[PDB]
Structure 1
Amino acid sequence: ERPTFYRQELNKTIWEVPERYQNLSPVGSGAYGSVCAAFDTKTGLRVAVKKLSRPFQSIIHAKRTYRELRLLKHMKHENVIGLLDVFTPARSLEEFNDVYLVTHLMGADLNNIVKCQKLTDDHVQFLIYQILRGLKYIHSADIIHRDLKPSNLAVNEDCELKILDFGLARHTDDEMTGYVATRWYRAPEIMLNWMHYNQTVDIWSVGCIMAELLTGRTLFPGTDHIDQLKLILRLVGTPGAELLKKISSESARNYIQSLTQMPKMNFANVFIGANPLAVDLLEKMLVLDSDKRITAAQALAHAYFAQYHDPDDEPVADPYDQSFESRDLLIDEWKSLTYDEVISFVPPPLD
C-alpha cells in the first residue's frame, strides 16, 4: 500500500517522491523549503510539491512544521489552498526526516493580474469578495494569515481566487527593510508592534489589495517603516487619544505623538472615479484602530458585493484545536506528532 518512490536531484536538492508525480521542475526555494511543479498522474492535476528544509532541525522548526501540516489538513474551502497530499519517503518514525506537501499548481498570482490586465469594477467586486469569503472561513477557525499580499493569492483564467502562503524564508527584519512589497500590505499595529494583534490585521491587507486593484498602484509603497507610517497617516489621519491608549508600546506611543496631527482624507478624491460603494468599503477597512475595522463576515454583507453575496454559500470552518500553540515539547515529540498527521492523512474526493 506504500507507493514506490523514485529519486531525483534538482538544483543540489534530492527529491524522493511517489511515482505518481512526474515531470518535476523547480519553481522556487528558500530557507524553509524548495518547490517543484509536477504532473500528478493519479488525479490528472498540475501540482506544486513543497519539500520542507530541515523540518526538525530545532524545536522552533519542528513546531512550525507541525503547525503548517495541522493548518493545511484543516483548511477545506474553495478560496483557500487545499492539501492534495502529504508524504515522506520514511518507512518508520525512526528514519522520518523529510516532509513533502502537495497542492494545485498556481502559475498566475494577483500581482501579475494587476500588472498585466485591465480590471473592471465587476472584476474587483469578484476578486475581493473571494478573498473576504476565504477570510471568513479561516477567521472562523481563529487562524490569521498575517502576510496577505497579491503574491499569496492564486488567480485562474475564470478569475477564481485562492488564498495561500508562498513564504519559503524566515520572516526577518532584513526582509522587511526598505522599499519592499514584503511590508506594504502589513497592518500598522504589526509593522510597528503596537500591541497584541487581532484577525482584522488581514482586513487592513485586503483594503491595501482592493485599493491597488482599483488604481493599479501600490497604496502605501513606503521606502521604510516610518515613511510607510507617514503615507498611512496622511490618508487615514493621525490617531486620537482613544487609539493611543491602546498602544501598549510606550516608545511607539511616544513616537506617534511627535507627529503633527492630520485629518482623514477624502477617499473619493484619492480613488477618483471609483464606485462610491468601493470607496465606502475602503473607509471601513482602512481604519487605524483594529477594534473598529469591518470584519470579513460584515464585509460580505456590504452593498458593494450585492452581485455575489449569498449567505447560504459563505461557509465557516469546523472547530480547530490550537492548544498545541501554548505547549512546550522536545523536537522528537513535535516530530512524532507530525509523523502521526502524515500517516493519518486522507486525500480529498477524487478530484
Structure 2
Amino acid sequence: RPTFYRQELNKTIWEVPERYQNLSPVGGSVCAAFDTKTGLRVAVKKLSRPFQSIIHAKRTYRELRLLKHMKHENVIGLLDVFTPARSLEEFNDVYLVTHLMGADLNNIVKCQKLTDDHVQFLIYQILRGLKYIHSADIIHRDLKPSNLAVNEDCELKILDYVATRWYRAPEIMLNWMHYNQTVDIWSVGCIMAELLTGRTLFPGTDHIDQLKLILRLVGTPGAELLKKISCESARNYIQSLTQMPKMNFANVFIGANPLAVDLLEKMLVLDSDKRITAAQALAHAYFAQYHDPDDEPVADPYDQSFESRDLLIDEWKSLTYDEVISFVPPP
C-alpha cells in the first residue's frame, strides 16, 4: 500500500499517493500533477461526491468501467485509479489519473489555419479511435473539438463555449430513439469541415435554427428516407419543409482537397443508414498517407449489461470499489 499525503486546493481536499507531485488545479475537479514514477505530466480527477445517490453511484461505476476498458492510442485511458480509503466501509472518494494532453482541437482551430496534411492526420486519428470505440458497441454521442485532446506532436486522443448542438447528428436533433454509431461520424464530418475552413459548419442559435442550417447544406429528405420514419410527428415535420436540394459540397469547401470534399460528402449524409462508418472512412483515399489496416485495432467486447440494472447505492459503491482494487496499471 502506498503512502498518501493531504492538501487543500480551492476549498477541496486532495489525498493522493506521493507518486504524484506539484498538484496544480486546471478545471469532478481536475489537477495537473507530476508522475514521479514515469516523469509524465498527468491529470488527476477527483470525482465530485461519487456515492451521494444512486444516480451518482451508477455514474461513478459507469465512468470507471469505461475508462478501464479503453486501451488505444487515440482514446483517453486510465493510467491509475485510487482512493485513500483502506476499506469498503470508509470508501467515499475516487481519483482517476490520465495523460495530461497539452491542448484541444478548439484551441488549435481558434489559433491557426491548418494545412490539409495536418487535417488528414487529425481526422485520421479521430476515426482510428472511433473505430475501436465503435467496435466495443459504444457510441460517443458528444464528439466536438473540446472533447479531442492533442499533444505538441499532434497526437490526438478522444476524451469522455463550443456548443454540443453544432456537432449533433440530425437524427438526434429530431429525437430518434434508435440512432446508431454513425451519429459520431456526423460529428466528425462537422469537425473536419471546421478544421478545413476555420469556421463552425452549423452554428445554430437553437434546435430549430440548427436544423435549418443543416438542411440548407444537405437538402431535405427524399422519399427513400421518409418511408423509414415511424412516427407521425417526425413525418409531419419533414413534410412541412421547403423542398431543398443538396448543395454540391465543392461549392461550399472551395479549394479544399477534392478527396476531403468527397469524404465530407460521405460523412455528412442526412440518412444515417447511408453514412460511412469509421472503418470504411479509414480506408478512404484521403487518408492514404496514414492508413494501415494492420494497425487500426478493434476493442474487446465491452459488457454494458449493468446499464440495465437497478441496484442500491451500496451495491453500485461496492462494485466500484471492486473495480478500483482490481485495477492493473498499463505497462
TM-score above 0.5 = yes
Deviations 1:155-210 (A, max 9, x none): 11211111112xxxxxxxxxxxxx96221111111123123111111000000000
In the TM superposition, what is the alpha-carbon distance from 1:151 to its structure 2 partner? 0.5
- Answer whether contact 2:106 2:162 (CA < 8 A) is retained: no
In the TM superposition, what is the alpha-carbon distance from 1:248 to its structure 2 partner? 4.3
- Answer whether contact 2:216 2:246 (CA < 8 A) is retained: yes
Aligned-pair identity in percent equals: 100
Deviations 1:222-254 (A, max 9, x none): 011110100000000111233234344532332
- Answer whether contact 1:195 1:249 (CA < 8 A) is retained: no
- Corresponding position of 2:120: 125
Instruction: Give unmatched runs, 5+ long, in structure 1.
Output: 28-32, 166-178
* Structure 1 residues 132 and 240: CA distance shift in structure 2, 3 A: same
- Answer whether contact 2:79 2:98 (CA < 8 A) is retained: yes
- Answer whether contact 1:109 1:154 (CA < 8 A) is retained: yes
Instruction: Give unmatched runs, 5+ long, in structure 2.
Output: none
C-alpha distance in 2, partners of 1:90/1:306? 50
C-alpha distance in 1, partners of 2:42/2:96? 10
Q: SS at 2:227's partner residue?
A: helix
- Answer whether contact 1:194 1:249 (CA < 8 A) is retained: no
- Corresponding position of 2:220: 238
In the TM superposition, what is the alpha-carbon distance from 1:8 to its structure 2 partner? 1.2
Q: SS at 1:195's partner residue?
A: coil
Q: SS at 1:11's partner residue?
A: coil
- Corresponding position of 1:203: 185
Q: SS at 1:86's partner residue?
A: strand
* Structure 1 residues 264 and 330: CA distance shift in structure 2, 3 A: same
C-alpha distance in 1, partners of 2:157/2:232? 39
In the TM superposition, what is the alpha-carbon distance from 1:319 to its structure 2 partner? 1.7
Q: Which moved more, 1:304-313 or 1:245-254?
A: 245-254
- Answer whether contact 1:194 1:248 (CA < 8 A) is retained: no
- Answer whether contact 2:144 2:162 (CA < 8 A) is retained: no
Aligned length: 330
In the TM superposition, what is the alpha-carbon distance from 1:257 to its structure 2 partner? 2.1
Q: SS at 1:291's partner residue?
A: helix
Q: Which moved more, 1:275-284 or 1:115-124?
A: 115-124
Q: Which moved more, 1:141-150 or 1:237-246?
A: 237-246
* Structure 1 residues 327 and 14: CA distance shift in structure 2, 3 A: same
- Answer whether contact 2:166 2:203 (CA < 8 A) is retained: yes
Q: SS at 2:52's partner residue?
A: coil
- Answer whether contact 1:193 1:249 (CA < 8 A) is retained: no
Cα RMSD (Å) of the superposition? 1.3
C-alpha distance in 1, partners of 2:89/2:190? 47
C-alpha distance in 1, partners of 2:317/2:86? 14
C-alpha distance in 1, partners of 2:239/2:320? 47
* Structure 1 residues 302 and 180: CA distance shift in structure 2, 3 A: closer
Deviations 1:74-109 (A, max 9, x none): 111011102000001111111111111000112211
C-alpha distance in 1, partners of 2:146/2:179? 23
C-alpha distance in 1, partners of 2:103/2:62? 26
Structure 1 residue 47 corresponds to structure 2 residue 47 = no
TM-score (norm 2): 0.97
Deviations 1:263-285 (A, max 9, x none): 10010000000111111110110
Q: SS at 2:32's partner residue?
A: strand
TM-score (norm 1): 0.91
* Structure 1 residues 21 and 271: CA distance shift in structure 2, 3 A: same
In the TM superposition, what is the alpha-carbon distance from 1:255 to its structure 2 partner? 2.2
C-alpha distance in 1, partners of 2:109/2:216? 25
